[model samples]
Target: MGHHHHHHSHMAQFPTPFGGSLDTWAITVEERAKHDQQFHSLKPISGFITGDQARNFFFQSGLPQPVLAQIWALADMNNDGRMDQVEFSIAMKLIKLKLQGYQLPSALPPVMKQQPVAISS
Candidate 1:
């Protein structure tokens, strides 16, 4: 039916992507702050991470696209096709999580939050 209305029913299933908070992922706000610094210098994100930018950055992880794609899905969270500060942080955090042997969660909480990204000269 190709039907989509940003719909969410009971389960409200979703995830960087979490409903509770970042701590659940063992991520600290300080780490996200680090991402802010780097991401800003990369582009005029005004606080964003595009696919091209994210891809290259992820490649540094030395991971295959197959694995990176999954990280993209989990980090993108909203399926918005754009990664904001929080979203991008999740991407980074998830990357670490995976490297450390944590399986990406299937259903992330359906919630959103904001943070600033930095890219300095």
Candidate 2:
């Protein structure tokens, strides 16, 4: 299973988000501590929220289809087409960030892969 980087250059290029960069997406921390409380109950598939379940929050974010699709691309990191706890957090954060004027990152910001804290939840 360790097959690494053979066609790694198969980089699937997409839109570069016509706005700000991802500096704000970096995890300094606070943004996650209480994030789960208000927005959860969406992860209904096994443990992840597939595109369908994600639709609710996605639409409520008030972003466009292109950007929302682009946003899902980043959050679905495993590429198995599902948004787990961490992935959902990434998507939600991304929704707000992009809605707030920040653009999508060239790749998923590694820091966002961490699971959001649920103690406050």
Candidate 3:
């Protein structure tokens, strides 16, 4: 007519060695050990973004900081005494924006096409 309940032979209970339940100190220790191993593995590259890391990355890219500085000077759109970190970030962002076919704000001045412009001209 309807349905009858049947006993399953393979019905079983999952067991934990913690003696009481799965939430035990022993399981926490194992989890902490796994976390420590993973954290230690990621520690080596933690210094990869420091100033020394930037120097090394630049050198490996075949341009020493002096040459790189000169390049930045030319691209310094603000025309201040020297380029700041903001200028560098803006330059990078503008490049990516251009690559993505997006236009930047119109307020920023144009990039230098040559060395310092002659005031006498």
Best by TM-score: 2
- What are the per-residue Cα lDDT tens digits for candidate 3 across 37-97? 3223223243212233333433444554664444344334444533333333333233323
Give me the overall lDDT of model 1. Answer: 0.57
Worst 10 residues of 3 by lDDT: 2-11
Worst 10 residues of 1 by lDDT: 1-10
- Per-model TM values vs. the true structure: 0.58, 0.58, 0.24
User: Candidate 2's residue-wise lDDT over 1-121, tens digit each?
Assistant: 2111111112233334544344465642333432353234564544335666676667666777777777777765655455555455556667767766678664754456555433335
Q: Whose lDDT is greatest here?
A: 1
Quality of model 2 by C-alpha lDDT: 0.55
**TM-score result, candidate 1:** 0.58
Question: Listing every candidate in turn, what is its Cα RMSD in Å to the true structure after a full C-alpha superposition?
Answer: 12.8, 13.6, 26.7
Model 1: colliding residue pairs? 14-108, 15-108, 36-118, 37-118, 40-118, 40-119, 41-119
- What is candidate 2's TM-score against the reference? 0.58
Model 1, residue 43: C-alpha shift (Å): 5.2
lDDT of 1 by residue, 78-104 (tens): 666666655675577666666766665
Candidate number that wins on TM-score, 2 or 3:
2
